[PDB]
Amino acid sequence: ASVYAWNRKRISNCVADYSVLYNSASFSTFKCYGVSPTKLNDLCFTNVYA
Amino acid sequence: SALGKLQDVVNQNAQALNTLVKQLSSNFGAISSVLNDILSRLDPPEAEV
């Protein structure tokens, strides 16, 4: 989507996989706030907004 | 209420202890008041600050 119409998806009721994102290393910017990018995102969340 | 002094002393001690217990769960400017949640979520430099 374009920036003004920022598209939002809700990640709900599924077993998340964050390891593949971290280990991919093709994503230039890997800045994580609150949760750390150093293999700690493997947790549980009530709601993920993408 | 004929023993108001002893009751007052006990109430003040209980109030101070309860206030300390309540203050245990204050953010103090941090992201969370639970230490374990901070440790299991955040990287060691930011976790330690």
Side-chain angles (χ1 to χ4, degrees), chain A residues 16-42:
Chain A
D17 194 353
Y18 299 110
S19 48
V20 306
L21 285 179
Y22 286 148
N23 67 50
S24 171
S26 80
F27 314 126
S28 159
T29 296
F30 289 119
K31 302 190 290 187
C32 286
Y33 322 98
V35 73
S36 77
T38 176
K39 301 296 289 183
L40 269 193
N41 193 9
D42 291 331

Side-chain angles (χ1 to χ4, degrees), chain B:
Chain B
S1 175
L3 283 73
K5 303 167 84 173
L6 317 177
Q7 200 59 56
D8 186 74
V9 166
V10 170
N11 288 341
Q12 292 179 357
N13 294 326
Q15 183 62 255
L17 183 63
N18 197 3
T19 300
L20 187 75
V21 167
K22 185 176 180 180
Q23 276 310 133
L24 188 152
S25 66
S26 296
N27 290 318
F28 292 119
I31 68 176
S32 187
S33 67
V34 192
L35 184 62
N36 297 115
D37 293 359
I38 296 180
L39 304 156
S40 82
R41 179 155 44 97
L42 184 62
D43 47 349
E46 273 74 17
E48 73 91 20
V49 67

